[PDB]
Each structure stands twice: as structure tokens, then as C-alpha cells.
Amino acid sequence: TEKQLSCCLDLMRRLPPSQIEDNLAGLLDLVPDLTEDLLSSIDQPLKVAYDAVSKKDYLLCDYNRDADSYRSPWSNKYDPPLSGACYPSSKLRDIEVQANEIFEIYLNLYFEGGVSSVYCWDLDDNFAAVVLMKKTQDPMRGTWDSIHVVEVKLGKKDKAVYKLTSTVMLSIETDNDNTGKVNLAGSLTRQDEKEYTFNEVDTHCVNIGKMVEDMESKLRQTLETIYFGKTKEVVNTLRNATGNS
Amino acid sequence: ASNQELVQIATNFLLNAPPCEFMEVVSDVRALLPSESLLNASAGSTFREYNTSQMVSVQTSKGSALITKEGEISNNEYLDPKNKQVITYDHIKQEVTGERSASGEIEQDIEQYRAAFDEEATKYCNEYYPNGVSAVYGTKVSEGIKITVCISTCIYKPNAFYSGRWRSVWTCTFKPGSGNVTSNGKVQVNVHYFEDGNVQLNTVTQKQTTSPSADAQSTAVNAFKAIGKAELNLHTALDNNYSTMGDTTFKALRRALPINRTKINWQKV
């Protein structure tokens, strides 16, 4: 129902971001015939899991999920274990391993901590993937969650089009005797499509990294303008500190 | 999954709608309810909770007024001391349905204090809140007199994708003629920006000030000098906080550039 999906998306853009988890579940209860679309177009902060085989942490999202289990990008195994699950094709898995390796580097360079995760899924002869970043800095605390869904459509010979839909979820919260309890929470999305020649030098992972880097660097500046400039601007039009004098 | 569970889900959406966008949220919800009758028993109480906690403003024949819990006489009747009237309000349609003169709701024995405070709240409101609407109530309490000051102002520019509201509720208690006035304030600020996303600022601050309780005129003037100072400081603190957050926690999340100021060489690495 385009009408209901339309109202869900609009509703989620108005409701408090901090209650997104409870609110999304609520919608699923209200309109289960939209469970797939909802789980797909509405994002929220991701939970961290531990891969005991690889001795590394990984991110949980609807992209590495099958039933109630989650696939680890490092071991390619599900937890809890289950039969009949979905795994990337042999060739796509090789790309997934390379992707996870470079983005963990990207993580080190742009976050200096946190956790990363990339999951790929076959789309016939084509494929798509999600690049995930999560970082929490520590009274004043903040949390950053990045999700980049990349869609790759091979184009005849050595040239492919990369479609990117990126979302960054950012929250900062402080509570003191000067300002009282202050909470900033939300997210911003931006898209970008681009064609690239992919070789053994300019691999898909390379083309995805360039697009992810540019996109996340642009969202960063927009986040900064809005979170610390636009909101401030609004408050100051609600209350004129110097007063009409 | 039960009808009542589905009812509680929708109630929570409604109660959490951002300022000035209540109707946009009410539409989305109604369109998600399998049956418009599901909330035909919870609505009134639900909308009333939102309207009064948001301290929405209304237009009467004598000017603007506020719909608050402190001025609530009945489930649909609100007192407006300034214009000596009782406003009947329809919480579901969000519109005034009645206007009459007060006939005893206002406590005359302390009205000189309420009136002296009202003059100050009005000027203060006109000075620091461009679209602000105020409301000053009064009542006798064990310790003497309680004067409640409510201020509420919002903004809505859907074309610019943003909205906001500032709510201040200062409760001033004092023994008439001597002693001090103890003013407890609760300020709440809300901002919603939704262009290609949804970002929200939510604040809740509680403060307490003290000032001399003498002749009505003075008691009011000095209470507002204190209240105005407290809010100025809070406003200042809020402006500073923006910088702190964006210059500390924010930069401590994702660098603008790697430690060696260079965009990754993807061919390598």
C-alpha cells in the first residue's frame, strides 16, 4: 500500500529519533504487510556482536540477517547457527573479504576506533553491499552510525555504475548544572550514482571506497551545519537574548 | 497484536509528535489504524495531554491565550485571568468553542499579586519572545501565595523543513508582605529539522531563584529580574554548549581527514 508506506516514512521523519527502535517495532505490529519495505527503508543505530571464531566484533543489521540469526563478515557463519540460510556466492564472498579488509583500514584512518562491517549479497550476475561504521565517544557523549548501501550494475566491459544511498545517524547528549539536560539526535541521507572502470587495479572495493569516502565527508559537513548551526539558529529566533531593545 | 495493543502503539505516536506538526502526525496515524474506531475512546484524553503539555495558544475575541494544565478548570475549560474569562476548547479539533466571563474562578483576595505579576510577565514576554504568548495564574497555598507563570512560543516553516518551541513554566511561592519569593523554573526547548532526514534538539532545564517579597509591585518586579537573569544564563549556556559539542564530542567521532590530512589512496592501502 503506497499510501501506508508513504505515511510510515513521513511519520518516522517526525517522531523522536531516540525512540526509533520502539517505534519501528510498533509500525511492524500496525502494518505487517510492510515488514520488508519498513525494515529496508528505515534505519536505526546498529548493535554490536562478537565473533568468537575470528575474535572480532561485527555489526548487526537487516542485511546480514536470516530468520533470527546474523552472519559474521569475518567467519561467514551465522549466530545462532541455522540451516538453509543465505550466504554470498563464492565469487562475491571473495569481494566481501577484500571489502571488509580495506574498510577496516578506512575505519582506522577516519575513526581511530569503533567497529566496521561490510556485507554483500548477490543480485543475479550483479551485486549490492552495505558498508557500516560505528563509533561512540565519551559529561558529554556521542554516537555515530554510518550505513552505505551500494548497488553495482555491471556494464558490458570494465565499466560499472555505482549507486549509493548513504545515511549517517548522529547523537550527542550532555547533562549539567548550567544547561540542564541537552539531547541532539537524528540522521541525514544523501544519494549519488557514478560510473567507473573496474580493473584489477581499480577493483570494485576501490570504487566503493572512493564513493564512500566522498559521501561520508560531505554528510559530515552537512551534519555539522545542521546540528550546531541550524538548530541554534532556530532557538535564537524563538528567543531574542538581547530583546527588542 | 491485540486491538488494545495496536491502540497503545498509536497513542505513543500521537503523544510524541513534534511541535506544530501534530496534525501531520495525526494523519499518518489514522491512516495506519486498521479501524478508525480503535481510538474512539482514547482520543480526547490523548489530544488533551498533548495540547496542554505543549501549552498551545488560541485566539479569542479579546486576544491570544494559552491552553495549559494550570489553567484547566474542566476537561475542556481553561481560565484566562488576564481577560477575566473562561475558554471552552475542543481538544480533538484543536479549536475554541466557547468564551465567557469568569464568575468566581479567579481568587480575588490575592488578585493584586497575580495582576502585579501579570504586568511583568507581559513585558518580559514581549521583550524576549517575539511570538510568545503568556499566562499568569494565582492561588492560595499553605505557605501563602503561589503565582504560576507560563510562556510558550513556537515556529513552523514546513517549506524550510523545520519547527521549534520554547516552553517556560515558573512557579513563584511567597508569604505576602515579607520573606522571599522562591521561584522554580522548568524550561523546555524543542527543535525539529527535517530536510533529507530528521534531526531534533530536546532540552529540559530546572532552576530555582530567590528574591524579596514586599509590596505586590516590587515582589513582581524583583521576581522577574531574577527569572530573567536565570533564563539569560541558561540561554548563554545553551549557545556555548553548541560549540563545545561540535568542537569536542563531534570531532572526536569521525575526523574530517585522516591524521595525515590526505584522502586515502585507494589504489594502495
Numbering used by the authors:
A (entry chain B): 2 to 139, 146 to 252
B (entry chain A): 2 to 270
Provide the authors' original text about this structure.
Capping protein (CP), also known as CapZ in muscle cells and Cap32/34 in Dictyostelium discoideum, plays a major role in regulating actin filament dynamics. CP is a ubiquitously expressed heterodimer comprising an α- and β-subunit. It tightly binds to the fast growing end of actin filaments, thereby functioning as a “cap” by blocking the addition and loss of actin subunits. Vertebrates contain two somatic variants of CP, one being primarily found at the cell periphery of non-muscle tissues while the other is mainly localized at the Z-discs of skeletal muscles.
We here report the first high resolution structure of a cytoplasmic CP. The overall structure of Cap32/34 from Dictyostelium discoideum reveals a similar arrangement as compared to its sarcomeric variant CapZ. Superposition of the two Cap32/34 molecules within the asymmetric unit revealed only small deviations in their overall structures, with a root-mean-square deviation (r.m.s.d.) of 0.3 Å for 512 common Cα atoms. Briefly, Cap32/34 has the shape of a mushroom, comprising a stalk (“N-stalk”) and a cap (“central β-sheet” and “antiparallel H5s”). The mushroom stalk is composed of six anti-parallel α-helices, of which three are contributed from the N-terminus of each subunit (H1–3). The cap consists of a single ten-stranded antiparallel β-sheet formed by five β-strands of each subunit (S6–10). In Cap34 the region located opposite to the C-terminal β-tentacle moves towards the antiparallel helices that interconnect the heterodimer leading to a more compact CP structure. In contrast to the α-tentacle, neither Cap32/34 nor CapZ crystals grown at physiological pH provided an interpretable electron density for the C-terminal segment of the β-subunit (β-tentacle), indicating that this part of the CP molecule is highly mobile. The sequence alignment further reveals that Lys-142 and Lys-143 of Cap32 are C-terminally flanked by three additional residues (Gly-144, Gln-145, Pro-146) resulting in an elongated linker region. Since “linker βS7–S8” provides a positively charged surface close to the basic patch on CP, it might participate in the initial electrostatic binding to acidic regions on the barbed end of actin filaments.
